[PDB]
Amino acid sequence: MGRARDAILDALENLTAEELKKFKLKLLSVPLREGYGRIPRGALLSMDALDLTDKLVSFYLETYGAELTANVLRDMGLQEMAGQLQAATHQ
Amino acid sequence: MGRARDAILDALENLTAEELKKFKLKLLSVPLREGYGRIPRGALLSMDALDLTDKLVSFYLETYGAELTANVLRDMGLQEMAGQLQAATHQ
Amino acid sequence: MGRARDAILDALENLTAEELKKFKLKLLSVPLREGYGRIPRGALLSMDALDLTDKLVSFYLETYGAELTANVLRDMGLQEMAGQLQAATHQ
Amino acid sequence: MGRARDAILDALENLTAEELKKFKLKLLSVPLREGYGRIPRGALLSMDALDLTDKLVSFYLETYGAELTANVLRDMGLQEMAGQLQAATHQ
Amino acid sequence: MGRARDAILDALENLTAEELKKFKLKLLSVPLREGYGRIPRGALLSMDALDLTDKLVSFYLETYGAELTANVLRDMGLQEMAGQLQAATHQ
Amino acid sequence: MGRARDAILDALENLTAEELKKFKLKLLSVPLREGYGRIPRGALLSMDALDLTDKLVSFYLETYGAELTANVLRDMGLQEMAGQLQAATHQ
Amino acid sequence: MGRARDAILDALENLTAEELKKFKLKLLSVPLREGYGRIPRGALLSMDALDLTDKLVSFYLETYGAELTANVLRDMGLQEMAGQLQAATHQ
Amino acid sequence: MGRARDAILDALENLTAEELKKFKLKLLSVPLREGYGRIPRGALLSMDALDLTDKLVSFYLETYGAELTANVLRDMGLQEMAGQLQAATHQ
Amino acid sequence: MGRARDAILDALENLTAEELKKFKLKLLSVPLREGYGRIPRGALLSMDALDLTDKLVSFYLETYGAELTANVLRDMGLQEMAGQLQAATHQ
Amino acid sequence: MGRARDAILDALENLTAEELKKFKLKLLSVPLREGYGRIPRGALLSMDALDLTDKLVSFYLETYGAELTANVLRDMGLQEMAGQLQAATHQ
Amino acid sequence: MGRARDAILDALENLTAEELKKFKLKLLSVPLREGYGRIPRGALLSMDALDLTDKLVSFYLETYGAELTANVLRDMGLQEMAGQLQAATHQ
Amino acid sequence: MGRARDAILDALENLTAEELKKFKLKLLSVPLREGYGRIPRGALLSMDALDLTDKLVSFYLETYGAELTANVLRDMGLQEMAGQLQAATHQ
Amino acid sequence: MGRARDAILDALENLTAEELKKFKLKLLSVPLREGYGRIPRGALLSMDALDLTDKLVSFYLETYGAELTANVLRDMGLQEMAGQLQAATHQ
Amino acid sequence: MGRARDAILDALENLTAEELKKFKLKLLSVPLREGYGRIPRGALLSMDALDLTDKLVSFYLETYGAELTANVLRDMGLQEMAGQLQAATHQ
């Protein structure tokens, strides 16, 4: 199976518990491409890093799952984890 | 078959576990129209969102099942989920 | 016999204990083509993955049984298992 | 989904922990329009910026949620964050 | 069903998590009218506001459930929530 | 809600760190009307201006909470703050 | 039930945070009457006023629970709260 | 049938979930009279208050079942529940 | 039978409740040799250590089941358990 | 008749449900003497303590049934149940 | 049954929340006699005092279970609890 | 990993607490390159040297993180610390 | 329990905030008898008088705990407090 | 088991609350040998001394776990703790 489920894990494990809550809150309002659904609010507010990675790779695909994570990380300020994620997924 | 069982599901899945319990508690004393029964305490205080949706569409109908849910949601303060539920069910 | 009963099993076996309930609930309201019946609520809410796959291939046929499963999976958000099922069934 | 949940977050994160308490205290007595509820004291006096933004966007809507926040910010003296919020939300 | 289970909820939700402990502790020693039982210590010291309201309306009735709660609230100093509860319940 | 929770805040925020201590100390011996309780020493000697305003408005009512604060302010010499508080609360 | 669980609470709530620690420390070496147990050090050094009152009335009885608290308060210097407790409990 | 199965329940319901574990642990090593067996560890460490009461009145008799419970409660420090149980059972 | 089912248990029983979840998540994406199947998500995300060991020795054999476990453990950083497993299995 | 089916029961009833699973799993690979068979997996992973005791005394004999149980109990760390089993069986 | 399970509990209940963690960590490397097993890390780092006492008396015997506890307690500095444990266990 | 996280630490540890506050105040208005975010006021005005270094290296990269710090240090007068930082980071 | 935990408290409560630091610093290098441990710097350099007394009586015994404190007090110059401690502890 | 887990503990308990944070920050940038992983920031910036010792001995081995700690301690200035650690570990 694709390695995109491991690049996201190494990015969501390098950020503290106060930035994970902000990530999960930003994930409720980020614009989405057509044909994709949105994770319900009842789950996004309890999931930890592992469940969040699994849900991200399940609802979206590998490529879009990586791109959306990188865009959200860039938007909230952190550009080191976003850069690492882009470097890992792109090649 | 009627799609009002899917609008209620999207309304009970966007609220946390401390708001679902309040919803189930206020469902015990909400005024009811004539000819409709009340869900007993034994089962109502254990069902999750899916079981709650099924049971709500079981005792009540599509139209009244949506209206009662919207009224209860507006009663407890949440006017976003109630608004989207009304928008979906009305048309 | 047809191999479409095996593609459905490989898709419903990757669903957790909470997503299978949502699948079985969405199966009660999904629009149906003319000439096909609906699974009764008495048995639908008790089956496991194997019984669900067998019953789905029983009421519907291979092609429609795969298409309905893929549509229900896409509707509830999961677009990875839906894509896998489509790839397996189409060719 | 609307972006007014993001403009409020950028306004409640630029004020210290001594002004957040004042904001949450003035939120308990601010005048409200008809049809809207008031956040209970039990939860309002324990939330941080993220939960406060989520609850403010949930109880009210995007437009009124932004207007009330701007009015409360202007009431307590801070005219820079209120102006930034108005500029972000209006256009 | 009577609306006395809603007036009590609005009174136990406007007091913090340190006053709820005091409420539950004082509930173990207040005088009781004849014919009524006392909540056991094992369950009382673990309930939050919702279960507390449910059990208070369960063991006692609506009228006595409101009067006892108002008396306990007045005993521990809080004369705002007690006054609001009295105003809601009496008329 | 009542606007008397804001007039008290504007009066306790104009007190230096040495005058707030004297206010909190003289609040321990001021005569009280019948039916009202006294704030315990455990919490009274730790609260800041915001918590003090909240507790003053909770233990007493709006009218008595304002009158007692004005009387205490006048008693220790400061008549500018007491005069402003009286002018704000009365009309 | 006995009122002695309310007289102790009004005595442990009138002492600051550095006197509760001293109270809990002197509670570890005060002489005890025969037949009564000693609170373990593991839980005694974490209890706040409410849990301390509950445990004090649980391990000992009303009369001995009041007398021991009065003796400990007198031994550590505070003669006002000890006098208040004695007056409340005796009559 | 004897009322000794009701006095034990009223004593095992006034103790919290952290004291029930200690009760069940001390029940594994308390000295026993001749002719009586010991509850196996496999079922003892999973029973709740109701099952524990039933097992205690089943393996032992009413008189010895009350005496053993009182002695175990007195051994572990709690002399209020033990005294209440003794008063209830003796006369 | 083979003793490699006991060396794996001694390695999966020394992982905390948070590292077993990571092990089960990384087991969903680890590269696999030809001719071997993959455990479905529906069952793998609920297994504890004992069922995980049994399933690992069921789908894979003794040698490959040990090598895959050692590789997964080493990949997530844990190089003490991997060393113990290698020492136990190789000789 | 032989009493070794009762000594085994007293050893399998003194261990919790989490250790019985480990016992049943370690029974799948323990070395066996020549001439004795192995319990199949289909039945072994469903039996409770009573069925396990009966089946263990069925395949093996009294002496070997006790010795194998003692060895397996020693392997998993429990040397108290193994000791009491040896004491009961040997004399 | 032996009373050495009661002397250990009175020693592990006198440790604060930070000394029990150190006890559990140092229990992972203490030298052991021949023939005795070591508690797995997965369960040892989550046990509280009661389960710790039960496991300590289960894996080892009464005498060794007390001696190991005394050795570990003295090794970390605390020679009061270890002293009373030795005094209780020896005679 | 890059060593620029250690060169910044030696620059923010040689300056007193009256200069760290000025550094943090100047960091709120310094011009920034395109695509980079600005640290919010709520967190920036509470960080010590270590948290400030971590946030500086996280929001920006190694090179820009060092260059911005050197520019800010040069702006506020200190040319020894900035020179040391430039010498360390450049080569 | 022994009264030597109270004689130490009456000696460490008469030290100003500048002499307690000197006492704690000299406690780090004082010669120790064989068989006794030394308090680590991580915890010792933050304790107040109450925690210091508790740790002093816990690590050492009553007699040695008093003697070491008296010697340290005499070594730093204070011979009135050391004399009082010796008089209290000796008889 | 090896005693190198206890030598690290004696070195991390001699660091104040401000030096442990610096140690944990230097642990994020220290060069690593080939074949060893790096602890994620999510858990590194929350751990206390005990969890840090356990995790350090978990990712690395006894020898490398000691050498890395000694080098990091020497880098940050403290050569007494590093000397003690080397003396303990080497022989």
Side-chain angles (χ1 to χ4, degrees):
Chain A
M1 190 179 287
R3 84 192 163 280
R5 206 181 301 232
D6 295 294
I8 302 185
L9 188 46
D10 309 345
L12 296 196
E13 263 189 328
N14 286 317
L15 57 84
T16 68
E18 182 65 26
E19 296 173 354
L20 192 68
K21 187 181 249 193
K22 197 177 161 139
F23 181 89
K24 297 187 290 184
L25 183 64
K26 299 298 293 295
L27 210 57
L28 284 171
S29 298
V30 60
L32 274 181
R33 292 180 182 176
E34 67 273 14
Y36 291 112
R38 188 173 298 280
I39 318 181
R41 213 177 63 99
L44 276 178
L45 296 176
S46 66
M47 297 205 277
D48 52 280
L50 303 163
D51 279 330
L52 195 51
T53 49
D54 200 7
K55 185 66 69 69
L56 265 173
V57 192
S58 179
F59 262 55
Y60 319 105
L61 270 300
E62 292 210 347
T63 294
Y64 195 42
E67 297 171 342
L68 188 82
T69 314
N71 300 342
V72 170
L73 282 172
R74 264 201 331 261
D75 168 42
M76 62 185 287
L78 321 173
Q79 293 179 356
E80 208 194 32
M81 271 85 78
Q84 282 184 11
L85 184 47
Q86 291 181 357
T89 61
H90 281 348
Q91 188 41 54
Chain B
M1 184 177 176
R3 297 292 298 274
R5 205 183 299 240
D6 294 294
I8 299 184
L9 188 44
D10 309 345
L12 296 194
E13 272 196 310
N14 285 315
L15 61 83
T16 66
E18 293 293 328
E19 297 174 353
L20 191 69
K21 189 174 182 180
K22 197 177 161 140
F23 180 86
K24 294 189 288 185
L25 183 67
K26 311 202 71 53
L27 211 59
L28 272 180
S29 46
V30 62
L32 277 177
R33 273 196 224 146
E34 67 274 15
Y36 299 101
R38 192 173 298 280
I39 316 181
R41 263 174 32 92
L44 173 83
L45 308 181
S46 84
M47 307 179 308
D48 50 279
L50 300 160
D51 284 331
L52 194 48
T53 312
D54 197 37
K55 186 65 66 68
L56 264 174
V57 193
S58 169
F59 292 102
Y60 318 108
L61 277 296
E62 317 292 326
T63 301
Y64 194 41
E67 296 170 341
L68 188 85
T69 314
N71 292 7
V72 170
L73 283 174
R74 284 201 290 81
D75 277 10
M76 41 185 308
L78 320 172
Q79 303 224 0
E80 207 197 31
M81 283 73 74
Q84 74 176 358
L85 177 61
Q86 291 181 357
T89 53
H90 282 349
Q91 186 40 54
Chain C
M1 208 38 75
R3 82 210 174 261
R5 188 184 268 94
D6 303 318
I8 302 185
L9 187 46
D10 306 344
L12 294 194
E13 272 204 319
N14 294 267
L15 263 64
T16 70
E18 192 271 331
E19 296 174 353
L20 189 67
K21 276 192 42 153
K22 197 176 161 139
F23 181 87
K24 295 189 291 184
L25 187 67
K26 294 282 191 153
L27 213 59
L28 272 183
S29 284
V30 63
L32 275 191
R33 275 193 225 144
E34 66 275 14
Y36 300 94
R38 193 174 301 281
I39 317 181
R41 211 175 63 110
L44 205 52
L45 310 190
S46 85
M47 311 168 138
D48 60 357
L50 298 159
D51 291 331
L52 194 50
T53 50
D54 186 36
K55 204 73 162 273
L56 267 175
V57 185
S58 190
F59 292 100
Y60 321 104
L61 283 86
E62 316 292 327
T63 295
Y64 193 39
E67 296 171 341
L68 191 83
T69 315
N71 297 340
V72 172
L73 279 171
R74 224 192 321 271
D75 193 2
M76 61 175 308
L78 323 170
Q79 291 193 0
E80 207 194 29
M81 283 73 74
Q84 279 172 10
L85 186 46
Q86 291 178 177
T89 50
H90 289 106
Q91 189 41 54
Chain D
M1 185 180 288
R3 301 310 292 263
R5 198 178 308 225
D6 284 290
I8 299 186
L9 184 45
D10 310 344
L12 297 196
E13 282 215 310
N14 293 26
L15 61 83
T16 70
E18 183 66 25
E19 300 173 355
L20 192 66
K21 286 192 43 153
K22 198 176 162 138
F23 181 88
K24 294 189 289 186
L25 184 66
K26 304 202 81 83
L27 208 62
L28 270 173
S29 46
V30 75
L32 275 180
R33 290 179 182 174
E34 64 272 14
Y36 293 122
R38 193 175 298 277
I39 317 183
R41 202 167 73 90
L44 185 60
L45 304 190
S46 86
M47 297 168 153
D48 54 354
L50 299 158
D51 293 298
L52 192 48
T53 50
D54 186 37
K55 194 112 181 183
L56 266 174
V57 161
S58 199
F59 263 50
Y60 322 108
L61 282 72
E62 317 291 329
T63 293
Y64 194 41
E67 296 172 341
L68 192 84
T69 312
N71 299 342
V72 170
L73 279 171
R74 270 161 29 229
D75 190 359
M76 61 185 288
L78 323 175
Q79 302 255 331
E80 185 177 2
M81 281 164 265
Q84 209 191 329
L85 187 47
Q86 291 179 356
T89 50
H90 290 106
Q91 189 41 54
Chain E
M1 185 64 72
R3 311 308 300 291
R5 210 180 282 231
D6 296 294
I8 300 186
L9 185 46
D10 308 345
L12 297 197
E13 270 203 319
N14 283 65
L15 61 83
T16 69
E18 193 83 359
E19 297 176 354
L20 193 68
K21 225 171 161 202
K22 198 176 161 139
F23 182 87
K24 296 192 290 185
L25 184 67
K26 294 194 92 43
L27 210 58
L28 285 171
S29 66
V30 311
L32 276 181
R33 272 197 222 145
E34 65 273 14
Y36 296 108
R38 193 175 298 278
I39 314 182
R41 216 177 58 102
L44 184 60
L45 303 184
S46 83
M47 291 157 158
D48 57 356
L50 303 162
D51 302 68
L52 194 46
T53 50
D54 175 10
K55 205 92 181 303
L56 266 172
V57 192
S58 177
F59 288 170
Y60 321 107
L61 283 85
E62 298 180 357
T63 292
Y64 193 42
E67 296 172 342
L68 186 84
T69 312
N71 295 330
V72 170
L73 278 170
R74 294 201 271 91
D75 192 2
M76 65 179 288
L78 322 173
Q79 303 225 350
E80 208 196 31
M81 283 73 74
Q84 181 196 30
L85 184 48
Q86 291 179 356
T89 51
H90 293 105
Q91 187 40 55
Chain F
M1 216 195 69
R3 71 183 184 274
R5 206 181 288 231
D6 296 295
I8 300 185
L9 188 44
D10 306 345
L12 296 196
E13 289 217 290
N14 278 69
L15 296 175
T16 67
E18 190 276 331
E19 296 174 353
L20 191 67
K21 224 172 151 183
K22 199 175 162 138
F23 181 89
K24 294 190 289 186
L25 183 66
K26 293 177 72 68
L27 208 59
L28 270 182
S29 46
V30 62
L32 290 172
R33 275 190 222 144
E34 69 275 16
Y36 297 111
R38 203 171 299 271
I39 318 182
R41 292 179 65 251
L44 195 52
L45 303 174
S46 285
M47 296 156 153
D48 58 354
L50 303 160
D51 284 328
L52 197 49
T53 50
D54 192 50
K55 205 82 161 153
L56 265 172
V57 170
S58 309
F59 262 56
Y60 321 109
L61 275 297
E62 315 289 328
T63 294
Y64 195 40
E67 296 164 339
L68 190 80
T69 314
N71 284 337
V72 171
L73 281 173
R74 262 202 330 279
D75 173 39
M76 42 192 267
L78 322 174
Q79 312 216 350
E80 207 198 32
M81 301 315 327
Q84 173 210 316
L85 183 47
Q86 292 179 178
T89 52
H90 293 105
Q91 189 41 54
Chain G
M1 204 205 78
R3 181 60 65 192
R5 203 174 289 211
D6 283 317
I8 302 185
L9 185 47
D10 306 345
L12 296 195
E13 272 194 329
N14 285 315
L15 61 83
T16 67
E18 281 306 80
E19 295 172 353
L20 191 68
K21 196 172 182 179
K22 199 175 160 140
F23 180 89
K24 296 188 289 184
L25 184 66
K26 314 272 291 203
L27 208 59
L28 270 193
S29 44
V30 65
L32 277 181
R33 275 192 224 143
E34 69 275 16
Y36 293 110
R38 188 172 297 280
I39 317 182
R41 193 165 82 80
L44 189 50
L45 302 185
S46 311
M47 294 175 169
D48 55 355
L50 302 162
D51 293 298
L52 197 48
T53 49
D54 185 28
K55 183 58 69 73
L56 264 171
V57 194
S58 296
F59 275 4
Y60 321 107
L61 277 297
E62 318 293 326
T63 295
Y64 193 42
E67 295 163 338
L68 189 82
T69 313
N71 297 339
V72 170
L73 279 174
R74 273 200 321 261
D75 172 41
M76 63 184 288
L78 319 175
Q79 302 256 341
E80 205 199 31
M81 281 151 45
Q84 271 186 10
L85 187 47
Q86 293 179 179
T89 53
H90 290 106
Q91 189 41 54
Chain H
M1 182 155 258
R3 285 311 200 100
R5 209 180 301 231
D6 292 290
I8 298 185
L9 189 47
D10 308 345
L12 294 193
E13 271 196 340
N14 293 295
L15 61 83
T16 69
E18 207 48 57
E19 298 174 354
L20 194 68
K21 267 178 72 84
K22 198 176 163 138
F23 183 88
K24 295 188 287 186
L25 186 68
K26 303 222 92 183
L27 211 61
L28 271 156
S29 45
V30 58
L32 277 183
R33 272 195 222 145
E34 67 274 14
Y36 291 102
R38 192 176 298 278
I39 315 182
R41 185 163 81 90
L44 196 42
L45 301 192
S46 66
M47 280 179 189
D48 45 7
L50 301 160
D51 279 328
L52 195 47
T53 314
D54 204 9
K55 204 72 181 273
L56 267 172
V57 193
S58 160
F59 273 8
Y60 320 108
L61 296 175
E62 293 179 354
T63 296
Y64 192 40
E67 295 171 341
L68 189 83
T69 314
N71 301 317
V72 170
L73 281 174
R74 215 203 321 297
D75 164 11
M76 67 190 287
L78 323 172
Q79 303 214 0
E80 207 198 33
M81 271 145 278
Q84 173 204 291
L85 183 47
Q86 292 177 176
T89 52
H90 285 350
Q91 186 40 54
Chain I
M1 211 189 313
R3 311 309 317 269
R5 204 184 299 240
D6 296 294
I8 298 185
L9 190 47
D10 306 343
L12 297 193
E13 282 212 308
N14 287 64
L15 305 173
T16 70
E18 190 276 331
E19 295 172 353
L20 190 67
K21 265 180 82 144
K22 204 162 171 313
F23 182 88
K24 294 190 289 185
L25 187 66
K26 304 213 81 63
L27 208 59
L28 270 184
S29 297
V30 62
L32 274 193
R33 276 193 226 142
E34 68 273 15
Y36 294 110
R38 189 171 298 280
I39 316 180
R41 301 183 50 247
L44 172 73
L45 295 198
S46 85
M47 296 182 145
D48 49 278
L50 302 160
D51 315 298
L52 195 49
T53 50
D54 183 48
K55 186 62 74 73
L56 266 174
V57 193
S58 310
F59 282 40
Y60 319 104
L61 292 164
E62 315 293 330
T63 301
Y64 192 39
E67 296 173 342
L68 191 81
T69 313
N71 285 340
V72 173
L73 279 173
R74 184 201 330 299
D75 170 42
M76 42 187 306
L78 297 174
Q79 303 224 20
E80 209 194 31
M81 316 278 157
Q84 279 169 221
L85 187 44
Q86 289 179 176
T89 51
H90 293 105
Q91 188 41 54
Chain J
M1 201 195 88
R3 296 311 270 287
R5 194 191 267 91
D6 297 293
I8 295 186
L9 186 46
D10 307 345
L12 297 194
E13 271 202 329
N14 286 317
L15 62 88
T16 71
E18 184 66 26
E19 297 172 352
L20 192 68
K21 228 190 182 183
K22 198 176 162 138
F23 182 88
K24 292 188 287 186
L25 184 67
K26 294 211 92 83
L27 211 60
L28 273 182
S29 43
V30 61
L32 279 183
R33 291 178 183 174
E34 66 273 14
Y36 298 102
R38 203 178 279 297
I39 315 182
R41 262 175 31 90
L44 188 52
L45 308 191
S46 86
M47 308 213 274
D48 56 353
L50 299 163
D51 281 329
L52 195 51
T53 295
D54 184 44
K55 186 63 66 68
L56 264 172
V57 177
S58 296
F59 287 103
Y60 319 106
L61 283 87
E62 318 292 328
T63 293
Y64 193 38
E67 296 174 341
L68 190 82
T69 314
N71 291 337
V72 172
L73 280 172
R74 274 211 301 281
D75 192 1
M76 41 195 308
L78 323 172
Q79 312 217 330
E80 208 195 30
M81 260 65 69
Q84 72 176 356
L85 183 47
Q86 293 178 358
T89 284
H90 281 349
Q91 52 75 41
Chain K
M1 192 188 117
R3 301 319 290 279
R5 203 174 298 221
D6 297 302
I8 297 185
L9 188 46
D10 307 345
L12 295 194
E13 276 201 320
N14 285 49
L15 313 167
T16 68
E18 294 294 328
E19 295 173 353
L20 187 68
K21 195 172 181 180
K22 195 177 161 138
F23 181 90
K24 293 190 288 186
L25 183 65
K26 293 179 72 67
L27 209 59
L28 271 182
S29 79
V30 61
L32 275 191
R33 292 179 181 176
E34 311 66 20
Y36 293 108
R38 191 175 297 277
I39 296 173
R41 209 166 65 75
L44 172 63
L45 299 192
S46 85
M47 284 175 160
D48 63 358
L50 301 161
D51 301 288
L52 199 48
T53 49
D54 184 57
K55 182 63 70 70
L56 268 175
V57 194
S58 297
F59 273 8
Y60 320 108
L61 284 85
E62 316 293 329
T63 294
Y64 193 41
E67 296 168 340
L68 192 84
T69 312
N71 294 347
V72 172
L73 279 173
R74 292 184 291 113
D75 175 39
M76 44 194 305
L78 320 171
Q79 291 185 358
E80 205 199 32
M81 279 140 266
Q84 68 181 358
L85 181 48
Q86 291 181 357
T89 50
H90 293 105
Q91 189 41 54
Chain L
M1 194 144 288
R3 84 192 162 280
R5 195 171 257 142
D6 295 292
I8 298 186
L9 187 46
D10 309 344
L12 299 192
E13 283 216 299
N14 287 321
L15 61 83
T16 69
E18 205 47 59
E19 301 173 354
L20 193 68
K21 187 175 180 180
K22 196 177 161 138
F23 179 89
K24 293 189 286 186
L25 183 63
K26 294 252 151 193
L27 207 61
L28 273 181
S29 296
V30 69
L32 275 180
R33 293 179 184 174
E34 66 274 14
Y36 287 100
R38 191 176 297 278
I39 318 180
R41 263 175 32 92
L44 189 149
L45 293 196
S46 86
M47 311 195 148
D48 53 355
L50 303 163
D51 284 308
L52 192 50
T53 49
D54 181 38
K55 187 61 71 74
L56 266 173
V57 173
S58 191
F59 262 56
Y60 321 109
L61 273 300
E62 314 289 328
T63 293
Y64 193 39
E67 295 171 340
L68 190 85
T69 310
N71 292 6
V72 171
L73 282 171
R74 281 198 276 88
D75 189 358
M76 51 175 298
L78 323 173
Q79 302 225 350
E80 205 195 30
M81 293 180 183
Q84 196 192 334
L85 185 48
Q86 291 179 176
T89 52
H90 280 348
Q91 188 40 54
Chain M
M1 202 65 108
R3 284 303 211 150
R5 212 190 290 253
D6 291 292
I8 302 185
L9 185 45
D10 310 346
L12 296 196
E13 271 196 320
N14 293 56
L15 306 170
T16 68
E18 188 72 348
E19 292 178 353
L20 192 68
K21 204 193 271 213
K22 196 176 161 138
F23 181 89
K24 294 191 289 184
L25 183 66
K26 297 216 84 64
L27 208 59
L28 270 185
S29 66
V30 65
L32 275 174
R33 292 180 182 176
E34 69 275 16
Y36 295 113
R38 189 174 296 277
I39 318 181
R41 301 180 53 250
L44 189 148
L45 291 202
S46 82
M47 298 190 142
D48 52 354
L50 302 161
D51 279 332
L52 195 50
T53 49
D54 207 0
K55 205 92 181 293
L56 265 172
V57 169
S58 179
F59 265 52
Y60 318 105
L61 291 193
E62 314 291 326
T63 293
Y64 193 40
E67 295 168 340
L68 183 63
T69 312
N71 301 347
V72 172
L73 282 173
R74 261 193 282 102
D75 172 41
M76 72 172 49
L78 321 173
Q79 293 181 357
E80 206 196 31
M81 293 180 183
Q84 171 207 51
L85 184 45
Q86 291 180 177
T89 50
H90 281 347
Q91 187 40 54
Chain N
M1 201 36 78
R3 283 303 221 159
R5 175 140 40 210
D6 294 292
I8 300 185
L9 187 46
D10 309 344
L12 297 195
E13 293 179 353
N14 290 319
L15 314 167
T16 69
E18 195 270 331
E19 298 173 355
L20 191 69
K21 207 194 271 212
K22 195 176 160 138
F23 178 87
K24 292 188 288 185
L25 185 66
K26 304 292 251 173
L27 209 57
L28 271 184
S29 297
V30 57
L32 274 179
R33 290 180 181 175
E34 66 275 15
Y36 297 101
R38 192 175 299 278
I39 315 183
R41 300 182 51 249
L44 200 42
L45 308 191
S46 83
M47 275 169 168
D48 54 354
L50 302 162
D51 280 331
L52 194 50
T53 49
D54 188 38
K55 199 75 152 304
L56 267 172
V57 177
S58 181
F59 287 100
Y60 316 104
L61 278 162
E62 316 292 328
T63 293
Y64 192 37
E67 296 168 342
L68 188 84
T69 312
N71 303 342
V72 172
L73 281 172
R74 264 153 42 210
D75 273 349
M76 64 182 288
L78 322 173
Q79 291 182 356
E80 183 178 1
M81 261 64 66
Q84 293 164 11
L85 187 45
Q86 290 182 357
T89 52
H90 295 105
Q91 187 40 54

